[PDB]
Design a protein around this ligand. Structure first.
Ligand SMILES: NC(=O)C1=CN([C@@H]2O[C@H](COP(=O)(O)OP(=O)(O)OC[C@H]3O[C@@H](n4cnc5c(N)ncnc54)[C@H](OP(=O)(O)O)[C@@H]3O)[C@@H](O)[C@H]2O)C=CC1
Ligand SMILES: COc1ccccc1/C(=C\c1coc2nc(N)nc(N)c12)C(C)C
Length: 186
C-alpha cells in the first residue's frame, strides 16, 4: 500500500462543515481538485482507497456515492455492514489501515486518502508515521458547526510546492482560496 494522506477544504475560522454540507457555496474547480487528487493513482493496476466517517459518507449526494474510481471505506461502530454503495466498513482507523494489508486489499490499494470528518482527521493527524495533509485554505470566515483539528506546525512542514498542485490564489463565486500540502514523518 502506498502513502497515507488527508485532504480537506477549510475556512479561515477552521470550519469544514455546517448541517452536513459545506459552509461555503459549491466551488466547482475546488471539487474537481479533490476528485483528481484522490482518484489519481501512482501505480498500474491499483486504485486509491478513501476512508471516511459515517456522517461524511452520507453527506455525499446519494447519486455521487460511492466516489467513483476509488475504493470506498466507511468507519462506524454502529453500522453492521457497509452502507448502500460503499465497499468496506471498519470500526476504527487502525482497523481500516490493518485491513489494507489483508489478502483482499494488499495488492489493490495505492494511496490511502482520509476525506473526513473531524474525528477521523484528528486521529490520523496524531498517529505516528509518514503523513501528508492536502489543505485548501478558503480565505474567508464561514459559519460552521464542524472544524478541522489543529495542525501542529512543529511536526507538519508546509511544502514550498508540490507537483500537480497550483501554488497561486484561486477564486470561484467571489471566494479566494489556495492549495497547500503539509508533510510530517514521526
Ligand atoms: N473538506 C471538507 O470541508 C469536509 C467536510 N466534511 C463535512 O464534515 C461533516 C461530517 O463530519 P463529522 O460531523 O466530523 O463526522 P464523520 O464523518 O467523521 O462521522 C462521525 C460518525 O462516523 C463514525 N466514526 C468517525 N470516526 C470513527 C472511527 N475512528 N471509528 C469508527 N467510527 C468512526 C462514527 O459513527 P458511529 O456512531 O456509527 O460509530 C461517528 O458518529 C459534514 O458537515 C460534511 O459536509 C466531511 C469531510 C470533509
Ligand atoms: C460534501 O462534500 C463532498 C461532495 C461531493 C463529493 C465529495 C465530497 C467530499 C469532500 C470534499 C468535497 O470537496 C473537497 N475539497 C477538499 N479539498 N477536500 C475534501 N475532502 C472535499 C466527501 C468526502 C463528503
Amino acid at each position: 500500500v502506498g502513502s497515507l494522506n488527508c485532504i480537506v477544504a477549510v475556512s479561515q475560522n477552521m470550519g469544514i462543515g455546517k448541517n452536513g454540507d459545506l459552509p461555503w457555496p459549491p466551488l466547482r474547480n475546488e471539487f474537481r481538485y479533490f476528485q483528481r487528487m484522490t482518484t489519481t493513482s501512482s501505480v498500474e493496476g491499483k486504485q486509491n482507497l478513501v476512508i471516511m466517517g459515517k456522517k461524511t459518507w452520507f453527506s455525499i449526494p446519494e447519486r455521487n456515492r460511492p466516489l467513483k474510481g476509488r475504493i470506498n471505506l466507511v468507519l462506524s461502530r454502529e453500522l453492521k455492514e457497509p452502507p448502500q454503495g460503499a465497499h468496506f466498513l471498519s470500526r476504527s482507523l487502525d482497523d481500516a489501515l490493518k485491513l489494507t494489508e489483508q489478502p483482499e486489499l494488499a495488492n489493490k490499494v495505492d494511496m490511502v486518502w482520509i476525506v473526513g470528518g473531524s474525528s477521523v482527521y484528528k486521529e490520523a493527524m496524531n498517529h505516528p508515521g509518514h503523513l501528508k495533509l492536502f489543505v485548501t485554505r478558503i480565505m474567508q470566515d464561514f459559519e460552521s458547526d464542524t472544524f478541522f483539528p489543529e495542525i501542529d506546525l512543529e511536526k507538519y512542514k508546509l511544502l514550498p510546492e508540490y507537483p500537480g498542485v497550483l501554488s497561486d490564489v484561486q477564486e470561484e463565486k467571489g471566494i479566494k482560496y489556495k492549495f497547500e500540502v503539509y508533510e510530517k514523518n514521526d
